[PDB]
Amino acid sequence: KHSVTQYLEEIPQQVQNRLYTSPATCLAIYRILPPLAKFFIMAMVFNENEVPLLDLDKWVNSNGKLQFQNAIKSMKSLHLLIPNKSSGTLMINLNPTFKISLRNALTGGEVQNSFGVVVEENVVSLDLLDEYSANKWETILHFMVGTPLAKIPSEKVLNLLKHSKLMEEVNSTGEFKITNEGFQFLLQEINSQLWTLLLQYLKMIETSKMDLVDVLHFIFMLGALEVGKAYKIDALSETQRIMLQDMRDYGLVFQKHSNDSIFYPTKLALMLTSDTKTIRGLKNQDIPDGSLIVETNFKIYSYSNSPLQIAVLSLFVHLKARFVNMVLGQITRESIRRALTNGITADQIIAYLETHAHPQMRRLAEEKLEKKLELDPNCKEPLQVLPPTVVDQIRLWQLELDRVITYEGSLYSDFETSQEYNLLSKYAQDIGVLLWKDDKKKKFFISKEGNSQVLDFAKR
């Protein structure tokens, strides 16, 4: 996961300060914070006094302080705070530009971004601008990866996606296929697709006529909620409205007809911001309108089959005939290598198969899952959850494509005292960050977690 939040912090301070100016932007970014960052930052919003880290170092009780160490590295990344190496301690205070920027919005703020949209008769119906918007997303979804009908008109997105090469298709031959990114795009359920899209919109439209901060207000104007009346009319900058028009063009904005009206608050914009229920000519049966067959029996058996929905499945299994109910096929360890023929590992498929086609595997996945979590300490025999026989069937299917091993971390040396090593030996076993180690070398290639927990046990 590219973790757009990492890009969010990636932007420098002044542009963050440029984004810190808008309380609505200050507001939206808050929900990204962990509850540590969420609650604790709220405190310094009010008591106007920089607090040295020693108080906060003292605030957290036993295990959970690593999140503070996670938090401090996190907040430095987006520079929401201002560290002060004043008195040998770390005299931490907020970045009020954001801190006081949101502080106004806390008690009925004057954040024009929050008030840019006009509350009016939000006449956008359930199916209206959602069925089309979902159909737009579905239509481009079929077109982008390659569906029976490619009705997606996002040429600029296609130019951006083709230029970004995220859709691994031969643009010279006009191919629009799911490459490593495109197949990885299948991994992104709802937001993830929009995230790379949001990144693609950011990456594509980010240099020429950027005005991103102004667009960001429009972005978070879309990100905030449904515009209702006067949205496009009033709350729309040149980039913001154009981006809103661009966002409205892609269906992610369910703008009213004629492209000139108040903001039509389609569900699409909220959903990527939501991370919640992902539910979207005149007939539509769901969720089980699309379904397939995947179980411990290792076979495909469909009684629903939605051509775009089943188009995803057929890329890693041979298909014989799309029945009225069925997509006739049988999964084989070679069949999954059809994805590996593209190089797509059946690794996203692990969760995906437990996620997708479940409309036809509600009973089977539930019989697989069997709620075997509370009984796990008591009963030690799991019921194929998640299917290890399939995993075994999957794992040795990869035997065709072999010979890769590497690991992430950092080189660690200059270690002298074994007591602490022995102390950390169990303490690392207590904290469980061990990819691999060896006392023969006292050297390992892992993250920086072990030092910080040793740092803040009894020091100050």
Contact residues: another protein, CB under 8 A: 27, 30-31, 35-36, 38-39, 42-43, 46-47, 58-61, 64-65, 67, 105-108, 114-115, 119, 224-225, 275-276, 378-379, 400, 403-407, 409-414, 445
Pairing of strands 318-322, 410-411: unpaired
Q: In whole angstroms, what is the distance from residue 292 CA to residue 284 CA?
A: 18
Q: Torsion over CA of 71, 76, 82 and 85, rounded to 10 degrees?
A: 90
Which CB atom, from 49 or from 208, has the smaller least distance to another protein? 49
CB of 4 to another protein, least distance (A): 17
CB of 111 to another protein, least distance (A): 9
Give the tokens for residue 391. Answer: 């995993």
Which CB atom, from 121 or from 414, has the smaller least distance to another protein? 414
Which CB atom, from 42 or from 150, has the smaller least distance to another protein? 42
Q: Torsion over CA of 415, 416, 419 and 423, rounded to 10 degrees?
A: -10
Residues with Cβ within 8 Å of 232's Cβ and at least 6 positions away in sequence, in order, are 241, 244, 245, 248, 255, 259, 260, 261, 262, 263
Helix (H) or strand (E) holding 454: helix 449-455
Which CB atom, from 121 or from 155, has the smaller least distance to another protein? 121
CB of 45 to another protein, least distance (A): 9
CB of 114 to another protein, least distance (A): 6
CB of 138 to another protein, least distance (A): 26
Which CB atom, from 152 or from 235, has the smaller least distance to another protein? 235
CB of 445 to another protein, least distance (A): 5
Which CB atom, from 308 or from 385, has the smaller least distance to another protein? 385
CB of 71 to another protein, least distance (A): 11
Which CB atom, from 7 or from 30, has the smaller least distance to another protein? 30
Give the tokens for residue 368. Answer: 């697989």
CB of 300 to another protein, least distance (A): 24
Residue 365: CB atoms within 10 A of its CB come to 20
**DSSP strands (E only) in 294-344:** 318-322, 327-330
Full DSSP string of 108-159: T---HHHHSSB-------SSTTTHHHHHHHHHHHHHHH--S------HHHHH
C-beta separation of 187 from 194 below 8 A: no
Which CB atom, from 43 or from 210, has the smaller least distance to another protein? 43
C-beta separation of 245 from 259 below 8 A: yes
Give the residue ranges of DSSP H helices in 226-287: 238-249, 267-274
